[model samples]
Target: GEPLYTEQDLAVNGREGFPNYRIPALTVTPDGDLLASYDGRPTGIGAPGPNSILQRRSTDGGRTWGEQQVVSAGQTTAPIKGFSDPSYLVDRETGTIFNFHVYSQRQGFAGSRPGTDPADPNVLHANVATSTDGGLTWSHRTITADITPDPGWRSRFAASGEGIQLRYGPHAGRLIQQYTIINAAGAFQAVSVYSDDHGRTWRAGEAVGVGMDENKTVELSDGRVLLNSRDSARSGYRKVAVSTDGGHSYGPVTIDRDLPDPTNNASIIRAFPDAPAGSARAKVLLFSNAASQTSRSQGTIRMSCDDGQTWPVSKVFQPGSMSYSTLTALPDGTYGLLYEPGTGIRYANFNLAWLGGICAPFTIPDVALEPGQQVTVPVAVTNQSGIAVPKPSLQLDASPDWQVQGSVEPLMPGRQAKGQVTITVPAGTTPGRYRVGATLRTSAGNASTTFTVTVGLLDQARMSIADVDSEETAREDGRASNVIDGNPSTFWHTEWSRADAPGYPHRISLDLGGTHTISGLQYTRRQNSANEQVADYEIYTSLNGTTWDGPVASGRFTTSLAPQRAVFPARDARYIRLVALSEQTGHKYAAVAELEVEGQR
Candidate 1:
């Protein structure tokens, strides 16, 4: 089916004397005007090389744009100066639109020194431009001294996205601009630069997060500030922090693993800006970024109904090379997005219907249990769609070793239904953390949620190698005895140097040395590299070494160097068998650094 959305190229390179354009910042004015700002690189795409802050206005909700105008210009001569990274915040009460950026001379963020003087060529200056008549004209001011906390910071500037205006709380009507600062030691941190008196004055908040960069902020339902930042370490996830006291101070930063980022600038905004906190409308938050781990492609938009707690619906806005992006809520009940697609800057307008589905206020708390224990958890799912969903059902996505049973009742629009999920951890199951997800299926669409189930802990028992498929003795000291050894440096690898070396399904059988009530097995891969790591395998228990009872547990292991655990129902057995189904790198080989059985004798 065709989705309901529209896209247009708003800013193109080589059209207005600038050879390239980057870093998009977008927001809507109080008078229902769309204001877009970005960096216009005249000479090259790199910063500190004669870049200017450019703006364009759209009165009809971005269907068409007016001519581009330079809000802040840079010089191309010696001691060259530039203004870049424009972010906008509109104070609805005062009808003032403020655009913030960094004004640099001779150096940008990297070479900028620790100083508060605007005249210093090596010091970066924080500047803001204000428009009173709905972005028709602008006035500029350099607030370097007003917001700087001493001169300990090397470089700091407003992030290249939209700032937020608080709507609910003691700090209501306060304007917040997200800023990233580089300290004297060249470490990145995020701080909130806010103005309590509309746009008259600004104050710098205490720094938060280590190795953070290019952040954006949103106001939660309870009036707390949620700061989502780009991780400078490229940790394949975005960093998030919260501030209870407006935007002045923040709590510890944590990694939001649900939002996969390629260390690129992203955007987050409230779906309904005017909705009161704790209202149903305020629960919806929209986020956009290049949802990838290695490359800046796959520009995806995700919807979270639990105030950034969990994302249940995601759609790819741009499936190509995408970079920086910005989002804003339109006055007409829709949403607007401005993002870079490697070619140029494009504007997209979409509604909730185009996003496929909405997330319900659903969650399952993590639980811990002993082997062979059974627990019934209460779960609920809400129907946030426009129409009622008949014959709604719940399904669990988990390993076959787990026994889970649940069912969801039919739901009316805007109504929530409750159900119960029963999970049984098999006896002799391994002690480790496992993820279980539940999906609510309906005739209209589907919504999903997840929880973790922690089984017993790893209590390694003495085990002796009983049998093996094959062991390499020609190339290295790869023997079956190396697996039972406590050292991780030595590994048991399948013979592969000869032409007739056995291909997988490799088997390693272990005798518990005595009959033990075991729940799981732990497999540790070679510590040096990822070669010959096991990917898929099955576990079997046996009373005698000759005949195994069954392959009770089966699953795939991740490509991580950490030790992996496999758990199953607890059972008394003397012999346990581990069968390798495939290798992680698709090689016809298998290797194990060390193996241990977990249970009580």
Candidate 2:
């Protein structure tokens, strides 16, 4: 962070540039002029705002910006549909600025009439305009694909998730346009077009097909472009692809087997100086995000140094959820990352301060220890590469809500970030789902990781310290205690007690084990659990101890010591096990504890 360029948002015309909502595309001019464009949705999507394409300019290089202006109000006049994702390029040949974009309109969806076929796919067209007045002038939106395709023709779909200029001169020299398509299947399909005439007309170009789908693309230094894409059957991290024939053909691919697929289109960009030309795949720095485990899981970003051959660095973009990610290399060679707010189109920006070596963050592993049933979660953070990592921010987000629990934001350089912040989950936190994760932020980059939390069982197993070959819970004044209590802010170490677990609605396994469908589960404690750990509870079942199926029923309600109980969703299951994860402090190991599961046979 100390050695690299500082990447910050350009406050256009003194107004705080918003990086939280709309997806914006960027371009830099020879004079170091910064131009960013994004859809200014009047509303957050549900409203009438497929409206305008807004732009901001920075004349004083990229350090600052002038004012912002609406480049295309094409929708207002023609009464058209939504305009989205503006990708712009400044012409070095004529010092002319050309911006390319796409629009998805409803009327255009159906073949010939309004509301003709609800089944008909939406229609989209690409448009290009040259700004003689430097991003302030006007130009009508023209359709590159003039006629809408008839389903009978089986034409390739249109609509771009991302569009950019070719990296090298010969490849990007002409009226060449590259974009990620919004195909019929909701996957990314690469589309490109070449215009012999400057801004007049265009010709169909070759399409680069990818196996999986992601949203990022970067031009490498060796003239070969590196595309981050995925194949649907198995979704994971953004894989690396080469495009030697311009943006048309992405050649031989080297996949990041461990990088989670970018279930959706993930944005990728490389870090480089303002060199006149460079190969796309060889660009020094690259970043991408996709699902961590599967396409269905939360998304994460990884870094590749040797083209795309190996990704030595990684970080979870939105580890908690999914949505696409967009990255841009700022003038300072640092990255400006923006992505969706999981299940939503909202966005956030982050900076990667590059230190001398490949300085970056590495997440501390997730800790799965219980509150009173204390357990140790090992911490071993590494650089993955040759560079030594410093202690960066180690922000922990725990289960239940997975909100911000703790943070180690600013970290030193070249030192592997490590350490543990003992957290006391709700004393009622028992033997079930609980998690603790860490995020590391450094000068070069940022990374994160998540670990599972399991509230261990009580001493009722008759397993003494010597019995299980485990150490004693704790000892005081020559006496031993099997219990400790505290809130999430603080936890008592080396303690274990059975009553410390919640006993709410009892859960019972349906003897009909063949996918037993049930309604609810219940548990009970000595109704006098005031300082007792829990006020609510849930139930779950499984076919195998290794695989938990679902919660047949779970409920949260106000209850007196009369057996705090509730029931939830009716579900299907097999083997049923009651998890007494969280408990009240005063609730100690009691043999009378009972849990009953309820489900439909």
The best candidate in terms of TM-score: 1
Q: For candidate 1, lDDT tens digit of each residue in 370-454?
A: 7799998888775565577668777898779889988766677778878888999888675665789887766555677789876
Model 1 regions lying over 4 Å from their true place: 1-3, 361-388, 394-407, 412-439, 443-445, 450-601
Per-residue error (Å), model 2, residue 461: 32
**TM-scores vs. true structure, each candidate:** 0.71, 0.50
Q: Cα RMSDs of all predictions?
A: 9.5, 14.9
Q: Worst 10-residue stretch by lDDT in candidate 1? A: 454-463
lDDT of 2 by residue, 113-214 (tens): 221132332434455656766666757555534322322222222222334455464666554455444344443455555554455665554445655432
